[PDB]
Ligand binder design. Sequence first.
Ligand SMILES: CCOc1ccc(-c2nnc([C@H]3C[C@H](NC(=O)c4cccc5nccnc45)C3)n2-c2ccccc2F)nc1
Ligand SMILES: [Zn+2]
Lengths: 41, 160
Amino acid sequence: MAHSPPGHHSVTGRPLAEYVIYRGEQAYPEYLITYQIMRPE
Amino acid sequence: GSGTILIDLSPDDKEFQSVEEEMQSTVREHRDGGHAGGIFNRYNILKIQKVCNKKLWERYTHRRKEVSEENHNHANERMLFHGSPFVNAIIHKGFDERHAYIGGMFGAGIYFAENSSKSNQYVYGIGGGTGCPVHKDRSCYICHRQLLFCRVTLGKSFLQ
Ligand SMILES: CCOc1ccc(-c2nnc([C@H]3C[C@H](NC(=O)c4cccc5nccnc45)C3)n2-c2ccccc2F)nc1
Ligand SMILES: [Zn+2]
């Protein structure tokens, strides 16, 4: 797909839930999280 | 419902004659020898109507400004012809890229031309589809066609 299907604004899949938008202005990058993955004990 | 009003322009109106002259003067001989759009050097111009829709205009001017600010305060706005089987939908609902045919050589986009005879090739579909609905004739002289003469924001255009 290049864009949302006709009548739609996004795509949701489960190949866990993933959400896809085809226009950058349909998301605001509200929080920046700086982190490391933790080595499990 | 639709907030689109169609304003019928008089043949004696300068605005009519300007759009009329652009339509007639931008006809060219095509490589397919009239296969897609039919054999003609001229049109019978039946009607020219100003499409008035506040919602669609404000949507356009908003995007035009966004593009303008992205391209050194230059919209790179052009008046261009559009042909497709969906003109009746577009005048009411506006242009919708979600219906763009991906098989096109320039990808999933909406196509415009500065030659009216080019846009005429797409009125009944890609390569003129199966021609007019009544006679199944790509070169039909009887059935009425519709083009749009559109205000188009090109901004920074990529050459292919
Ligand atoms: C060799 C090059 O090939 C080509 C040539 C031309 C095209 C092409 N360019 N634009 C379109 C239409 C317009 C768009 N649809 C709507 O704007 C729409 C809005 C509102 C409601 C709708 N409802 C249904 C459908 N569309 C709309 C697509 N096309 C185009 C696309 C498919 C078939 C013929 C076409 F001319 N694409 C490729
Ligand atoms: Zn016909």
